[PDB]
């Protein structure tokens, strides 16, 4: 009779992503006949781990150009620096991305006595 | 006529932001990146979880599935932490009410 | 016997040459044999992991053909004829 | 007999215990030293759930066998 209150599985994991909403997605995601109750939780946090893991890189890189508001370039500049993440997204391109400053040595200028 | 709410992870994204960076803001375009960014990873995951089912002829995707796919899909050490956070989450949700 | 040994050197200087022939390579430098074995393993490395990874996900102690298959496909190398 | 428990922080808690000591006793001691009430507590042994009435030797828990600490959060 009393719900009396309420609790969210996300809170129940103390995690920021909407376990409920995700857990809805898979149900209609045509991803399996049934959805394990535990799974989405586990599935949720992973993203909530990554989303930080990337942003942290950006923010530090965002501070580098000394602009308090993250931009795409940073994300791009961020992603290509992590030697792991680059292999995650290598097939993927970013809007407003650009690329890392890079120059081949033999093309460098010369006085070099 | 006009509504039907177009669901994103934005708010969810935005919450996370303050925990890692209390100061910083984000542009919708930048936000637009993240919202799309989720699904791509997200679909990559499911499809692999799917494939597991057949190859074990399981009819159901449980947690154990996803993790297996995680180690496949993510590269290098990042996986383990992902493994970790998800695991740490599951337990914490496991004892829940 | 002791413990397992050379292995990767077990891909022989003449052997790779045969491939290179099928590769359409007229003359071969010496140091090739080094880097070649480097790449080969590196390739086999990630490949094996996945089939292994499937395998444990199967709770089965044995790698099968189907295992190697599903390794290549999510790799992008997809192959035929050993798959069932 | 000395054992440990590992936390979400990886904190390693020193424990002087006995194989016949109840989980009831143990958590209380953690409640005792660490002030955290069992209501929000559970300890793990090899993934199994620990009931108070169980003792250490019930799980064949040996000296310096380290455990996985949990904060079970009711509310929030």
């Amino acid at each position: 009779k009393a719900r009396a209150r309420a609790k969210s599985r996300s809170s129940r994991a103390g995690l920021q992503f909407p376990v409920g909403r995700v857990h809805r997605l898979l149900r209609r995601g045509n991803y399996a006949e049934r959805v394990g109750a535990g799974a989405p939780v586990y599935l949720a946090a992973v993203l909530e781990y990554l989303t930080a893991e990337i942003l942290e890189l950006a923010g530090n890189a965002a501070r580098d150009n000394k602009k308090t508001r993250i931009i795409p370039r940073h994300l791009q500049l961020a992603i290509r620096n992590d030697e792991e993440l680059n292999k995650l997204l290598g097939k993927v391109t970013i809007a407003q991305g650009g690329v890392l400053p890079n120059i081949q040595a033999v093309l460098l200028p010369k006085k070099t006595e | 006529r006009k509504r039907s709410r177009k669901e994103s992870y934005s708010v969810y994204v935005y919450k996370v932001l303050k925990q890692v960076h209390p100061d910083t803001g984000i542009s919708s375009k930048a936000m637009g990146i993240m919202n799309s960014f989720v699904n791509d990873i997200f679909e990559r995951i499911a499809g692999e979880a799917s494939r597991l089912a057949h190859y074990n002829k399981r009819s159901t995707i449980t947690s154990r599935e996803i993790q297996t796919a995680v180690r496949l899909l993510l590269p290098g050490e990042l996986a383990k932490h992902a493994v970790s956070e998800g695991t740490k989450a599951v337990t914490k949700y496991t004892s829940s009410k | 016997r002791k413990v397992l040994r050379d292995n990767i050197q077990g891909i022989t200087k003449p052997a790779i040459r045969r491939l290179a022939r099928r590769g359409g390579v007229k003359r071969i430098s010496g140091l090739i044999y080094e880097e070649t074995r480097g790449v080969l393993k590196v390739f086999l490395e990630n490949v094996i992991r996945d089939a292994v990874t499937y395998t444990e996900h199967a709770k089965r102690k044995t790698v099968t053909a189907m295992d190697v298959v599903y390794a290549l496909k999510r790799q992008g190398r997809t192959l035929y004829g050993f798959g069932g | 007999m000395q054992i440990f428990v590992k936390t979400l922080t990886g904190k390693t808690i020193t424990l002087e215990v006995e194989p016949s000591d109840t989980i009831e006793n143990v958590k209380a001691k953690i409640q005792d030293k660490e002030g955290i009430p069992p209501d929000q507590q559970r300890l793990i042994f090899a993934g199994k759930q620990l009931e108070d009435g169980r003792t250490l030797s019930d799980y064949n828990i040996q000296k310096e066998s380290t455990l996985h600490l949990v904060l079970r959060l009711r509310g929030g």
């Binding site: 586990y42 893991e53 942290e56 890189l57 620096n81 992590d82 030697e83 792991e84 | 947690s63 154990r64 993790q67 180690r71 050490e77 990042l78 383990k80 932490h81 493994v83 970790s84 956070e85 695991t87 740490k88 599951v90 337990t91 | 990874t53 444990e56 | 922080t9 990886g10 793990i44 993934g47 996985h68």
Partner: peptide, 21 residues
């Protein structure tokens, strides 16, 4: 030694992952 989704969640070393750049 991979497992079944165990409780082995072993390391909070990710900072070293972030160090990789």
């Amino acid at each position: 030694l991979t497992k079944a989704a165990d409780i082995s969640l072993d390391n909070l070393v990710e900072g070293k992952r972030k160090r990789r750049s």
